[PDB]
CSV table of C-alpha atoms in Angstrom, one decimal:
chain,number,residue,atom,x,y,z
A,1,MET,CA,22.0,12.7,-4.9
A,2,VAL,CA,24.9,13.7,-2.7
A,3,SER,CA,27.4,11.1,-1.4
A,4,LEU,CA,26.3,8.7,1.8
A,5,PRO,CA,28.5,9.3,4.6
A,6,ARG,CA,31.0,6.4,6.0
A,7,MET,CA,29.0,3.8,7.6
A,8,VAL,CA,30.0,0.5,9.4
A,9,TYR,CA,27.8,-2.4,9.0
A,10,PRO,CA,28.2,-6.2,8.1
A,11,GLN,CA,29.5,-7.0,4.6
A,12,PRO,CA,26.8,-8.3,2.3
A,13,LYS,CA,27.7,-12.1,1.3
A,14,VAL,CA,27.4,-12.8,-2.4
A,15,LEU,CA,27.3,-16.6,-2.1
A,16,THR,CA,25.2,-16.4,1.1
A,17,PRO,CA,21.3,-15.5,0.5
A,18,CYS,CA,19.5,-13.3,3.0
A,19,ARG,CA,16.4,-15.4,3.0
A,20,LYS,CA,16.6,-18.9,1.2
A,21,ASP,CA,12.6,-19.8,2.2
A,22,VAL,CA,11.1,-16.9,0.0
A,23,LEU,CA,11.5,-15.4,-3.3
A,24,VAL,CA,13.0,-11.7,-2.8
A,25,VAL,CA,12.9,-10.6,-6.3
A,26,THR,CA,10.3,-10.7,-8.9
A,27,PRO,CA,11.0,-11.8,-12.7
A,28,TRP,CA,11.1,-8.4,-13.6
A,29,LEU,CA,13.6,-7.7,-11.2
A,30,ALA,CA,11.6,-5.8,-8.7
A,31,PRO,CA,12.7,-6.6,-5.1
A,32,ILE,CA,10.1,-8.4,-2.7
A,33,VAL,CA,10.4,-6.8,0.7
A,34,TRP,CA,10.7,-9.3,3.5
A,35,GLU,CA,12.7,-8.8,7.0
A,36,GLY,CA,16.4,-9.5,6.3
A,37,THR,CA,16.5,-8.3,2.7
A,38,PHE,CA,17.2,-4.7,3.6
A,39,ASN,CA,19.6,-2.6,5.8
A,40,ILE,CA,17.5,0.1,7.0
A,41,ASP,CA,20.1,2.4,8.2
A,42,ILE,CA,21.4,2.5,4.6
A,43,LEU,CA,17.7,3.1,3.1
A,44,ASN,CA,17.1,5.8,5.9
A,45,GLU,CA,20.2,7.8,4.8
A,46,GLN,CA,19.4,7.6,1.0
A,47,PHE,CA,15.7,8.9,1.6
A,48,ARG,CA,16.6,11.5,4.4
A,49,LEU,CA,19.2,12.7,1.7
A,50,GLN,CA,16.6,13.4,-0.5
A,51,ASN,CA,14.4,15.1,2.0
A,52,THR,CA,11.7,12.7,1.5
A,53,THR,CA,7.9,13.6,2.3
A,54,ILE,CA,5.6,10.6,2.4
A,55,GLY,CA,1.7,11.1,2.3
A,56,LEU,CA,-0.4,8.4,3.9
A,57,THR,CA,-4.0,8.4,2.8
A,58,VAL,CA,-7.0,6.7,4.7
A,59,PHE,CA,-10.9,6.8,4.1
A,60,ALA,CA,-12.7,6.6,7.2
A,61,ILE,CA,-16.4,7.0,6.6
A,62,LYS,CA,-19.4,6.1,8.8
A,63,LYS,CA,-18.6,3.9,11.7
A,64,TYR,CA,-14.9,3.5,10.2
A,65,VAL,CA,-14.0,6.8,11.9
A,66,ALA,CA,-13.9,5.0,15.2
A,67,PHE,CA,-10.6,3.1,14.0
A,68,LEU,CA,-8.7,6.4,13.4
A,69,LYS,CA,-7.4,6.6,17.0
A,70,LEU,CA,-5.6,3.4,17.2
A,71,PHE,CA,-4.7,3.6,13.3
A,72,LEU,CA,-2.8,7.2,13.7
A,73,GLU,CA,-1.1,6.4,17.3
A,74,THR,CA,0.3,3.3,16.0
A,75,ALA,CA,1.3,5.0,12.8
A,76,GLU,CA,3.2,7.6,15.2
A,77,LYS,CA,5.2,4.6,16.4
A,78,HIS,CA,6.2,2.8,13.4
A,79,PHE,CA,5.4,4.5,9.9
A,80,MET,CA,8.2,6.6,8.6
A,81,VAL,CA,9.5,7.7,12.0
A,82,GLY,CA,12.3,10.2,11.2
A,83,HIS,CA,10.9,11.4,7.7
A,84,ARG,CA,8.2,13.9,7.0
A,85,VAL,CA,4.7,12.4,7.0
A,86,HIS,CA,1.6,13.8,5.8
A,87,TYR,CA,-1.6,12.2,6.9
A,88,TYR,CA,-4.7,12.6,4.7
A,89,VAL,CA,-7.8,11.7,6.3
A,90,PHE,CA,-11.0,11.6,4.4
A,91,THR,CA,-14.0,11.4,6.2
A,92,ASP,CA,-17.7,12.3,6.2
A,93,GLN,CA,-17.4,13.2,9.9
A,94,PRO,CA,-14.8,16.0,10.5
A,95,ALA,CA,-15.7,16.2,14.2
A,96,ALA,CA,-15.0,12.5,14.9
A,97,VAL,CA,-11.4,12.6,13.7
A,98,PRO,CA,-9.6,12.1,17.1
A,99,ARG,CA,-7.1,14.6,18.2
A,100,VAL,CA,-3.9,12.6,18.0
A,101,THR,CA,-0.4,13.9,19.0
A,102,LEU,CA,1.9,13.9,16.3
A,103,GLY,CA,5.7,13.9,16.2
A,104,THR,CA,7.9,16.7,14.8
A,105,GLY,CA,7.7,17.0,11.0
A,106,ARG,CA,4.3,15.0,10.9
A,107,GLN,CA,1.0,16.6,10.0
A,108,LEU,CA,-2.6,15.8,9.4
A,109,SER,CA,-5.2,17.1,7.0
A,110,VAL,CA,-8.7,16.4,7.3
A,111,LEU,CA,-10.7,16.4,4.1
A,112,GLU,CA,-14.4,16.4,4.2
A,113,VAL,CA,-16.0,13.9,1.8
A,114,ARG,CA,-19.7,13.0,1.1
A,115,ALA,CA,-20.9,9.3,2.2
A,116,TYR,CA,-22.5,7.5,-0.5
A,117,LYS,CA,-24.5,4.1,-0.4
A,118,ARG,CA,-23.7,2.1,-3.5
A,119,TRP,CA,-20.3,0.5,-3.6
A,120,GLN,CA,-19.7,1.9,-7.2
A,121,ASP,CA,-20.3,5.5,-5.8
A,122,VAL,CA,-17.7,4.7,-2.9
A,123,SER,CA,-15.0,3.9,-5.1
A,124,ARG,CA,-14.3,8.8,-4.9
A,125,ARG,CA,-11.7,6.3,-3.5
A,126,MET,CA,-10.1,6.0,-6.9
A,127,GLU,CA,-11.7,9.1,-8.0
A,128,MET,CA,-10.7,11.3,-4.9
A,129,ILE,CA,-7.1,10.5,-5.3
A,130,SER,CA,-7.0,12.1,-8.8
A,131,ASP,CA,-9.2,15.1,-9.3
A,132,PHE,CA,-9.6,17.3,-6.3
A,133,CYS,CA,-6.5,16.2,-4.7
A,134,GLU,CA,-4.1,15.7,-7.5
A,135,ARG,CA,-2.5,19.1,-7.5
A,136,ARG,CA,-2.2,19.4,-3.8
A,137,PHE,CA,-0.5,16.1,-3.7
A,138,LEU,CA,2.1,17.0,-6.3
A,139,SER,CA,2.9,20.0,-4.4
A,140,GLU,CA,3.0,18.6,-0.7
A,141,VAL,CA,4.6,14.9,-0.7
A,142,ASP,CA,7.1,12.9,-2.6
A,143,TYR,CA,5.2,9.5,-2.3
A,144,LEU,CA,1.7,8.4,-1.5
A,145,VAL,CA,0.9,5.4,0.5
A,146,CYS,CA,-3.0,4.2,0.2
A,147,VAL,CA,-4.3,2.1,3.1
A,148,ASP,CA,-7.3,0.8,5.0
A,149,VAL,CA,-8.1,2.6,8.4
A,150,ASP,CA,-9.5,-0.6,10.0
A,151,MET,CA,-5.6,-1.5,10.8
A,152,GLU,CA,-2.8,-1.1,13.1
A,153,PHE,CA,0.8,-0.9,12.8
A,154,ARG,CA,2.7,-3.2,14.9
A,155,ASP,CA,6.1,-3.0,13.6
A,156,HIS,CA,8.3,-0.9,11.4
A,157,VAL,CA,6.9,0.3,8.1
A,158,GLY,CA,9.6,2.5,6.6
A,159,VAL,CA,11.2,3.7,3.5
A,160,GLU,CA,12.1,0.0,2.4
A,161,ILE,CA,8.5,0.2,0.8
A,162,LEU,CA,9.3,3.6,-1.2
A,163,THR,CA,9.6,3.2,-5.1
A,164,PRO,CA,7.7,4.5,-8.1
A,165,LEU,CA,4.8,1.8,-7.9
A,166,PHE,CA,4.3,-0.7,-5.2
A,167,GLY,CA,1.7,-3.5,-4.3
A,168,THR,CA,1.1,-5.8,-1.4
A,169,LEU,CA,0.8,-9.4,-1.5
A,170,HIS,CA,-2.7,-10.7,-0.1
A,171,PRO,CA,-1.9,-12.5,3.0
A,172,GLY,CA,-4.4,-15.3,2.0
A,173,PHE,CA,-3.0,-16.1,-1.4
A,174,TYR,CA,0.7,-15.5,-1.2
A,175,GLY,CA,1.2,-19.4,-1.3
A,176,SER,CA,-1.6,-19.9,-3.9
A,177,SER,CA,-1.6,-21.0,-7.7
A,178,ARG,CA,-2.7,-18.2,-10.1
A,179,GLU,CA,-5.7,-20.5,-10.9
A,180,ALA,CA,-6.8,-20.2,-7.2
A,181,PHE,CA,-6.6,-16.4,-7.1
A,182,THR,CA,-10.1,-14.4,-6.9
A,183,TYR,CA,-9.2,-12.3,-10.1
A,184,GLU,CA,-12.3,-11.1,-12.1
A,185,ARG,CA,-13.0,-14.1,-14.5
A,186,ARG,CA,-15.8,-12.6,-16.7
A,187,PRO,CA,-14.4,-11.4,-20.0
A,188,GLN,CA,-17.1,-8.6,-20.2
A,189,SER,CA,-15.3,-6.8,-17.3
A,190,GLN,CA,-12.4,-4.6,-17.7
A,191,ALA,CA,-10.8,-6.2,-14.8
A,192,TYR,CA,-10.8,-9.7,-16.6
A,193,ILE,CA,-7.5,-11.7,-16.1
A,194,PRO,CA,-7.8,-15.4,-17.5
A,195,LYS,CA,-6.6,-18.4,-15.7
A,196,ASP,CA,-3.3,-18.5,-17.5
A,197,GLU,CA,-2.2,-15.1,-16.4
A,198,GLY,CA,-1.4,-13.4,-13.3
A,199,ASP,CA,2.1,-13.1,-11.2
A,200,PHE,CA,0.5,-12.3,-7.6
A,201,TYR,CA,-2.6,-11.6,-6.0
A,202,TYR,CA,-2.3,-8.1,-4.6
A,203,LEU,CA,-4.7,-6.7,-1.7
A,204,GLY,CA,-5.8,-3.2,-2.2
A,205,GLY,CA,-5.6,-2.4,1.6
A,206,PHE,CA,-1.8,-1.2,1.1
A,207,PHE,CA,-0.5,0.1,-2.2
A,208,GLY,CA,1.3,3.2,-3.2
A,209,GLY,CA,4.1,4.9,-5.3
A,210,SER,CA,5.3,8.2,-6.7
A,211,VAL,CA,2.3,10.9,-6.8
A,212,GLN,CA,2.5,10.5,-10.5
A,213,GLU,CA,2.4,6.5,-10.5
A,214,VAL,CA,-0.6,6.5,-7.9
A,215,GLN,CA,-2.4,8.9,-9.9
A,216,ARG,CA,-1.8,6.9,-13.1
A,217,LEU,CA,-3.0,3.8,-11.3
A,218,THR,CA,-6.1,5.5,-9.7
A,219,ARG,CA,-7.0,7.1,-13.2
A,220,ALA,CA,-6.7,4.0,-14.9
A,221,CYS,CA,-8.9,2.1,-12.4
A,222,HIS,CA,-11.5,4.8,-12.2
A,223,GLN,CA,-12.0,4.6,-16.1
A,224,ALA,CA,-12.2,0.9,-15.8
A,225,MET,CA,-14.9,0.9,-13.1
A,226,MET,CA,-16.8,3.6,-15.3
A,227,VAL,CA,-16.7,1.2,-18.3
A,228,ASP,CA,-18.0,-1.8,-16.3
A,229,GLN,CA,-20.9,0.5,-14.7
A,230,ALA,CA,-21.9,1.4,-18.4
A,231,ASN,CA,-21.7,-2.3,-19.1
A,232,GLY,CA,-23.9,-3.3,-16.4
A,233,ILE,CA,-21.3,-5.4,-14.5
A,234,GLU,CA,-19.3,-5.0,-11.1
A,235,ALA,CA,-16.2,-6.9,-10.5
A,236,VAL,CA,-16.2,-9.6,-7.9
A,237,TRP,CA,-13.9,-8.1,-5.7
A,238,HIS,CA,-14.6,-4.3,-6.5
A,239,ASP,CA,-11.4,-2.1,-6.2
A,240,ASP,CA,-8.9,-5.0,-5.7
A,241,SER,CA,-9.9,-6.8,-9.0
A,242,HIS,CA,-9.1,-3.5,-10.9
A,243,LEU,CA,-6.1,-3.2,-9.1
A,244,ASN,CA,-4.8,-6.7,-9.7
A,245,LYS,CA,-5.5,-5.9,-13.6
A,246,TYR,CA,-3.5,-2.7,-13.4
A,247,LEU,CA,-0.6,-4.2,-11.6
A,248,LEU,CA,-0.6,-7.2,-14.1
A,249,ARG,CA,-0.2,-4.8,-16.8
A,250,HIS,CA,2.1,-2.2,-15.2
A,251,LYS,CA,4.5,-4.1,-13.1
A,252,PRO,CA,5.2,-2.7,-9.7
A,253,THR,CA,8.8,-1.6,-9.0
A,254,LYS,CA,8.6,-3.4,-5.5
A,255,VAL,CA,6.4,-5.9,-4.2
A,256,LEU,CA,5.7,-5.8,-0.4
A,257,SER,CA,5.3,-9.2,1.5
A,258,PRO,CA,2.4,-10.2,3.7
A,259,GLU,CA,4.4,-8.6,6.6
A,260,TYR,CA,2.9,-5.5,5.4
A,261,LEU,CA,-0.8,-6.6,5.2
A,262,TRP,CA,-1.7,-9.4,7.9
A,263,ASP,CA,-4.5,-10.8,9.9
A,264,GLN,CA,-3.2,-12.5,12.9
A,265,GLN,CA,-6.8,-13.9,13.9
A,266,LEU,CA,-7.3,-15.3,10.5
A,267,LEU,CA,-3.9,-16.5,9.9
A,268,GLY,CA,-1.6,-16.7,12.7
A,269,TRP,CA,2.1,-16.2,12.9
A,270,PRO,CA,3.7,-18.4,10.6
A,271,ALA,CA,7.5,-19.0,10.4
A,272,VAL,CA,8.0,-17.4,7.1
A,273,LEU,CA,6.7,-14.0,8.8
A,274,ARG,CA,9.6,-12.6,10.8
A,275,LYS,CA,7.7,-9.5,11.7
A,276,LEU,CA,3.9,-8.6,11.7
A,277,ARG,CA,4.0,-4.7,10.7
A,278,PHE,CA,0.7,-3.7,9.6
A,279,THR,CA,-2.4,-5.8,10.6
A,280,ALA,CA,-6.1,-6.2,10.9
A,281,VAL,CA,-7.9,-5.0,13.9
A,282,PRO,CA,-10.3,-7.8,15.2
């Protein structure tokens, strides 16, 4: 890691917090990323000096192919602009992937997959990431970001998210007590979390990390789903139950605020959200 250049920016103020209305660091000292916590100029330099490549994965099966055009057009405007980006679009319909114009240093790969009926079959989602694609991802990108396709970017989503392992706060539960979280509560499931455990409720629509960490996570969740299946049990919220168990026991190195996964139709635009970056599409 070579030196940063001279840069002129406002001095950070030790006795003035950036945000006093929200928690900006976890008890395991991982930053919680809200608008006003970061200087993007500094972070962009740090990441550009490493020639960072970010992989973005989306599964668009059956009718979900319809969401690709807005998803990708808005990612071009808002997602890691200035950095190398590789989109990985997993789909049962290669021909229905729209031809979207990409900025320089950005590429898109279409990966054909079979469509499956049962939700357990559906989740090569945890499979696909680690198995057919593991070597390719290690060769092609530095970080992997895994998102839902029925979304659009509306504001900056950049290198402030990048870290070995990140999850995103469920926008419906960020103010909730742990008792209210919809974790898997049956002890017979591998995703089980009791009422007196839990940091946050993470939503599986936006997670990521280094390739290695994302692979570990996906390998672990896949194995846990397989064990539940053999025991005749399905976790209450499927992928997200297992994701929450994983991130309980392997703390993320950054947590993203609900700015990064929002639904404006369901939740409005509260004062605590200064920006709505990645949102559900009505």
